[PDB]
Amino acid sequence: SVPPGDIQTQPGTKIVFNAPYDDKHTYHIKVINSSARRIGYGIKTTNMKRLGVDPPCGVLDPKEAVLLAVSCDAFAFGQEDTNNDRITVEWTNTPDGAAKQFRREWFQGDGMVRRKNLPIEYNP
Known part of the structure; x- marks a missing residue:
């Protein structure tokens, strides 16, 4: 069982959502599996x-990439909290002879889970 390797994301440190916020805007994040091993990943938001x-x-073979769609509903920016949103990419090396189909179990059994945060920044 070896620690999960590194991924590369685009954008790499954060994602900026531009107003207007009266419509749903769909953004995209590129996740690339730079490591030498197959990895399973889960995405979470605040x-x-x-x-x-x-x-x-999903699952990403070595050097494979996936393009994620991050949607942001319409909302009243002018009256809500916006200094605390983030997107979280979690991943782990896929266990030996496992299918290319994600199992929440990979993150619950003995092992290592790695995570990368991508804070959301609002440009009003």
Whole structure:
């Protein structure tokens, strides 16, 4: 069982959502598996009501990339909290002879889970 390797994301440190916020805007994040091993990944957000990611989980062979769609619903920016949103990429090396189909179990059994945060920044 070896620690999960590194991924590369685009954008690499954060994602900026531009107003207007009266419409749903769909952004994209590129996740690349730079490591030498197959990895399973899950995506999480701090605001299920406003934020959505798709696909929310998957598998990535070495050097394979996936393009995720991060949607941001319309909302009243002018009256809400916006200094706390982030998208979280979690991943682990896929166990030996496992299918290219994501199992939440990979993150619950003995092993290592790695994570990368991508804070959301609002440009009003």
